[PDB]
Design a binder for this molecule. Sequence first.
Ligand code: HEA
Ligand code: HEA
Ligand SMILES: [Cu+2]
Lengths: 504, 68, 78, 101
Amino acid sequence: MRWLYSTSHKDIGLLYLVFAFFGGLLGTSLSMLIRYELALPGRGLLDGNGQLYNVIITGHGIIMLLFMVMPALFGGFGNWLLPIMIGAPDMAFPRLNNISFWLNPPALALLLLSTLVEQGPGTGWTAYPPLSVQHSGTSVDLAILSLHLNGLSSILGAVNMLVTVAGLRAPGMKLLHMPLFVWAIALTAVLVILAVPVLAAALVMLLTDRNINTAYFCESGDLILYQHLFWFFGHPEVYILILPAFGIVSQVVSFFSQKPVFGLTGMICAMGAISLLGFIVWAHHMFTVGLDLDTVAYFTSATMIIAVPTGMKIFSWMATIYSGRVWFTTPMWFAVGFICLFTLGGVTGVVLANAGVDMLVHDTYYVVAHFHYVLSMGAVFGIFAGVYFWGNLITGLGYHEGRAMVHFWLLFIGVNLTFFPQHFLGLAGMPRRMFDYADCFAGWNAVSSFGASISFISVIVFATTFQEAVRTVPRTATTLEWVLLATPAHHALSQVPVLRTASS
Amino acid sequence: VEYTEDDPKPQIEEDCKPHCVKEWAAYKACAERIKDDTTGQAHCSGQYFDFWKCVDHCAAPKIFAHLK
Amino acid sequence: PFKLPLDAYILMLPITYASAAFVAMCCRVPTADPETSSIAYYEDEQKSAAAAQRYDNSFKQFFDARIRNHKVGVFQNW
Amino acid sequence: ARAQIERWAAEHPTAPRVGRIFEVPLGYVVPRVAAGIAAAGCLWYMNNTFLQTYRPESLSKEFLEEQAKIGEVAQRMNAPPVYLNPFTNRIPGSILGPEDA
Ligand code: HEA
Ligand code: HEA
Ligand SMILES: [Cu+2]
């Protein structure tokens, strides 16, 4: 009853976090089949079934992009933390916040049910036609309807976040005193509202091509138009998933360095510049489709400008740690590991942004290594940094510090030894979305499959970190969630706190 | 290992010859490159030495395995 | 919301450049050769060849001298 | 900024403050990450041994010896055979293949 009928943002955020953990377990399980099939040349445990392998990679990519990272960062930490952080007593629309969650288990059920129907939706997470149209049966329709429901969830959540920020702020607190987590969540909500309905329109076009015999992407239509619409959605999508990670890293780095953030207005202008440039560079996913050279020229020159604000943010994080009083705990390591390993994933993106170089490494495992750096070191590290940081405030349980460092080191060893050899495979010319390869690619695939087992064991050890908590009394803090008890009451901020400017 | 009256070393040297194909290609390129020289002052000793050094490095332990 | 820091204008110069390039690219496409909804456009071979060669030359004629000079790298690799 | 750190340290009493960069001693970390890597290696070995349905015939030792005899040589149906990858194996530009050498 409590968890079914809730209107509190703190219960809904915890439900999002538990759902995202479930989705992460599902995508970990689907990814051991990918690495267990690819360990050796020939035919593995899938018995040479290529359609089942395509189903596995499609479901795994969709699940890890949309039912793990977004429900953890945007829905889990944002809903729990935003009203406490800005001093709002609740969200602007408390029942819209419950339907923003409850459209996600139907979408997950539709996506998991499409795998048991016919031969499944083996198309890739991008679902390009005419391969998606050619699939006969029901599975692809269930997958696209799952994407539609998840997009509706995201749009409703973004509307609630944008109205909660603009109109329920604490008295005296302007748009200068909110933490960078709030600014990141607000910019993510703006990106969601501007980007998700274009995907919804493209998916409606895909259903009308599949089932109504229309002429959007077909014999008489244009198949490049789908890639235009989908990537106009999809390049804002990857920045939707990384901005709350930036906010969590700012809050963690500023906390244990005993210092405020270096360059707050520069940080906000950099996040805004990242949000604005993400809507005019979508066609770097389409260098090999046969666009004109002027279009490719522009989309090459405009993609590399995204390096400057991200570099400013990384250098400001280093300046925040600089000249501080640093104490290294498990969330502090996950932030240091973030800043170290996001830089490695970002620099390969600059290489991929250059179109002539991209003619050699398009649809190779080089791209896979790039986006598993910026997502398993960028978003997963940001998620795990917040789990150990705010965990006794959110859940009411503390964590054993030694086992958490064991989990961090097992994870850090596992994911580095998994995706670093995939750079060498992609440079040599090993293509994506294949379950059998040439005989010479055996060594780095064996190394990467060895690393994935370490990553799985790291996932196992994380369940052993939890233990009983110790509760003390707060006096002062630099943010509002650290003057509250652990756990807070159902109505946190029983009196609305105000911000008083000092007099003369 | 049986010991025979004929020499096993030429056969072992022939068997190690596919392992050094790049050296043989370089030697053949040298031999065809200097075919126009009229001064009498052009040879192919360096590439020949590289190829036979590769062949000897392959074939050295196999010869004494066949020798008493 | 705040005072724009001295960084933000240095950010805004290539951002304005990218926005102007995007607008010019989107604007020049309905003034291109294959954006004609007729077959009778190509039966005038002088005008169509002139239009399509003009579509080739612009934004490429800036690069002809260094294409001929093979300035394809930052360094000089032979 | 100091009081919130001191509050966090009181609610996390298992986190050490002993004056060194790695607060948890490495005598605790190293055997346990070693045990984790050992379990991962056991799983990886079990996949390599008991979960394969087709091992291709180009990885058998007879194929490997007969391929090592040939080397990196590609045949042609309209021309003499050619050395593969002439830069990383340092074939000179006068030599095109073994039979033409
Ligand atoms: C968020 C994104 C994300 C994450 C985390 C991962 C995680 C992993 N992925 Fe993958 N992957 C994709 C996104 C992701 N992946 C996408 C988009 C594709 C494309 C599919 C397509 O082309 O159609 C893909 C495809 C893909 C390929 C290419 C397949 C092919 O081309 O044929 C490979 C190859 O090795 C791979 C392996 C792995 C491995 C070993 C991990 C390991 O890291 C295992 C995971 C371990 C973790 C630790 C992460 C889990 C996180 C949690 C459990 C945190 C949640 C916890 C709380 C909320 C408390 N996945
Ligand atoms: C977390 C998600 C995430 C993030 C943040 C990014 C960030 C970037 N990405 Fe990427 N990308 C993906 C997720 C992401 N990407 C996914 C999932 C795909 C594959 C889609 C598919 O499935 O097909 C993909 C594919 C992809 C492509 C398509 C190529 C192809 O598939 O053929 C390109 C091309 O430009 C690209 C480039 C970039 C660039 C330039 C950035 C930049 O934002 C990064 C900028 C950061 C840095 C550059 C490092 C920090 C900067 C400094 C330290 C300053 C110094 C730097 C310089 C002086 C240059 N990535
Ligand atoms: Cu992109």
